[PDB]
């Protein structure tokens, strides 16, 4: 029958694959080469980036500078270690994004030893304002560039919640206050989202609508006894507890072999066995 299959050897002979990570849909190489290009007259001086990637269950922030051998991570901070600071549940909120960004700034500043002259803001009353670290005496703050990857930068996106935490953490990241949770209304709208006010208003909205719907979405919150009113205060203490001890933390891991290859001897035997059976 008619096939006209365009997959013949002539197709594959002239085929040119993409870059391996672009082939995987993980890297925008067109935008990456813009953020990797350090000035050529700044010989080998690292050009730091913030790699903010949000998974289905955690927020990943890493400070990296590119090299020919490969990207090198200067420091990193995750949202799965937030429970150490009192954030037990909801590790992908707008609030957990802020804490992870804030935690990475304090963890990085302590590593470089500049954690005493660069403090940023600390009180929750001024949480929703746009703050940028400035020069202290003559010493510039640590500068970083935001790398959002394959994420659409909408107004309320969490990639800027992490970026907002870094600026409040004392690390200078170029930005504008047009893609925060505010960018409209005022700092009270941004402060409410950073403190989880949006989260601790759907819990009570769902309670006033349906009991089973409440247990559906926030089932682990009743199990932990986290009342909606408690959400606002725990994020205040998490920022306080992060700022007093961010210095990371502390075996043999069970390895599971998966399939292993076949040697040339077994592979030859398999072909011969199949051939012998046919006769």
């Amino acid at each position: 029958g008619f096939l006209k299959v365009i997959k013949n050897r002539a197709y594959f002979k002239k085929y040119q694959t993409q870059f391996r990570r672009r082939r995987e849909g993980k890297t925008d190489y067109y935008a990456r080469r813009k953020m990797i290009f350090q000035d050529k007259d700044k010989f080998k001086t690292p050009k730091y980036r913030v790699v903010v990637r949000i998974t289905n269950k955690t927020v990943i922030a890493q400070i990296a500078y590119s090299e020919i051998i490969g990207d090198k991570i200067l420091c990193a901070a995750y949202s799965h270690e937030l429970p150490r600071y009192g954030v037990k549940l909801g590790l992908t909120n707008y609030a957990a994004a802020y804490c992870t960004g804030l935690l990475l700034a304090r963890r990085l500043l302590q590593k470089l030893g500049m954690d005493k002259q660069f403090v940023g803001v600390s009180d929750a009353a001024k949480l929703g304002e746009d703050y940028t670290p400035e020069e202290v005496d003559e010493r510039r703050p640590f500068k970083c560039i935001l790398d959002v990857g394959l994420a659409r930068t909408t107004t309320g996106s969490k990639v800027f919640a992490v970026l907002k935490g870094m600026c409040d953490g004392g690390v200078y990241v170029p930005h504008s206050a047009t893609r925060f949770a505010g960018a409209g209304e005022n700092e009270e709208a941004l402060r409410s989202r950073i403190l989880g006010g949006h989260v601790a208003a759907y819990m009570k909205y769902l309670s006033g609508e349906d009991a089973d719907l409440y247990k559906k979405q926030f089932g682990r919150f009743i199990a932990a006894g986290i009342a909606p009113e408690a959400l606002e205060n725990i994020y205040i203490e998490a920022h306080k507890k992060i700022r007093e001890n961010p210095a990371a933390e502390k075996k043999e891991h069970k390895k599971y072999p998966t399939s292993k290859k076949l040697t040339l001897e077994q592979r030859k035997a398999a072909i011969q066995a199949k051939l012998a059976k046919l006769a």
Binding site: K14, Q16, R33, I36
Partner: peptide, 15 residues
């Protein structure tokens, strides 16, 4: 042949 498109990043990263 089979070398179109974007180039290496070692081209823009070499010192």
């Amino acid at each position: 042949f089979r070398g179109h498109g974007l180039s290496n990043t070692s081209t823009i990263l070499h010192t």
